[PDB]
Amino acid sequence: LDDVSLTHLTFGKEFTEAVEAKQVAQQEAERARFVVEKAEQQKKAAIISAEGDS
Amino acid sequence: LDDVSLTHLTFGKEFTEAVEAKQVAQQEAERARFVVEKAEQQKKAAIISAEGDS
């Protein structure tokens, strides 16, 4: 055996839903992570400014 | 041996990912350093202004 790979994991109706669902969840995650990250950097900037002023 | 040099450290798919990742991260670093130095600039401007008025 040179190579064995699984191809097309499926339910007919369900597979389509499965892919779509994965996509949406991905979007959700992106949004949430971004917001948190920027909040963190935002606060960092605030500290730096305060320090800078000081 | 006149010269020996590594060329094309890859592979192809990752090569693209690698360059892209490098660019983005470096930009972030660029931003961070730029903002701090600029803060210094404003710091200086304020000082010079105060001495100027003085």
- Asked if B36 is an interface residue toward chain A (Cβ–Cβ < 8 A), one would say yes
Residues in Cβ contact with B35 at an 8 Å cutoff, skipping those fewer than 6 apart: A45, A48
CA distance B10 to B8: 6
The length of chain B is: 54
Mapped to the 3 state alphabet, what secondary structure does A8-53 carry?
CCCCHHHHHHHHHHHHHHHHHHHHHHHHHHHHHHHHHHHHHHHHHH
Method: cryo-EM
- Nearest to residue B40, comparing CAs of A7, A51, A13, A22? A51
Give A51→chain B minimum CA distance, Å.
Answer: 10
CA distance A36 to A44: 13
Q: State this model's resolution in angstroms.
A: 16.3
- Asked if A52 is an interface residue toward chain B (Cβ–Cβ < 8 A), one would say yes
The answer to whether A52 contacts B43, with C-beta atoms less than 8 Å apart, is: yes
Cβ-contact B39, A48 below 8 angstroms: yes
Give A16→chain B minimum CA distance, Å.
Answer: 27
CA distance B15 to B8: 9
Cβ-contact A48, B36 below 8 angstroms: yes
- Nearest to residue B32, comparing CAs of A47, A39, A41, A40? A41
- Asked if B38 is an interface residue toward chain A (Cβ–Cβ < 8 A), one would say no
